[PDB]
Design a protein around this nucleic acid. Sequence first.
RNA 1: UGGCCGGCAUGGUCCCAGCCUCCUCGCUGGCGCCGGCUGGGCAACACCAUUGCACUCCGGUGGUGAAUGGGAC
Length: 95
Amino acid sequence: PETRPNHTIYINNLNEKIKKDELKKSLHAIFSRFGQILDILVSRSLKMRGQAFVIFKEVSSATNALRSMQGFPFYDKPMRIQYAKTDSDIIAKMK
RNA sequence: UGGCCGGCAUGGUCCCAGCCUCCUCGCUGGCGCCGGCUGGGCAACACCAUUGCACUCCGGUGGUGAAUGGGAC
Ligand SMILES: [Mn+2]
Ligand SMILES: [Mn+2]
Ligand code: NA
């Protein structure tokens, strides 16, 4: 069951050996060109490792980042991007 | 030694280089041998498991079962 467009893009299949701080840094490095980023959430917990939530200010950016970077080799692995099932709080607190 | 103990071996204090380690990374730490008990912590490192949709920090296990020489007194 696919997901509907969202301000936030959910990414997984990310190299799990990368420290949280760097992963956010590097993600920002390759995603900032698609639009203003409000935040990037990463957690190395058993359940949230290898995944990340890039929160774009404008949905169009999210869509671009999704179409263009899908499959992109990052830290030796192909990035698998989707739209986040639900809105991130940062977005809720506005729209 | 992370904390504690037993057997044995072993002249001494320094100085230079090298090497070692999860538990005060280095020169007012350590670098003979053998055996047993034992606590903390995943922070780093490694290994195992994990493809997982969050906005609550939170998987497990392992390491010391470690590291040599040189020189002045
Ligand atoms: Mn030590
Ligand atoms: Mn030894
Ligand atoms: Na861990």
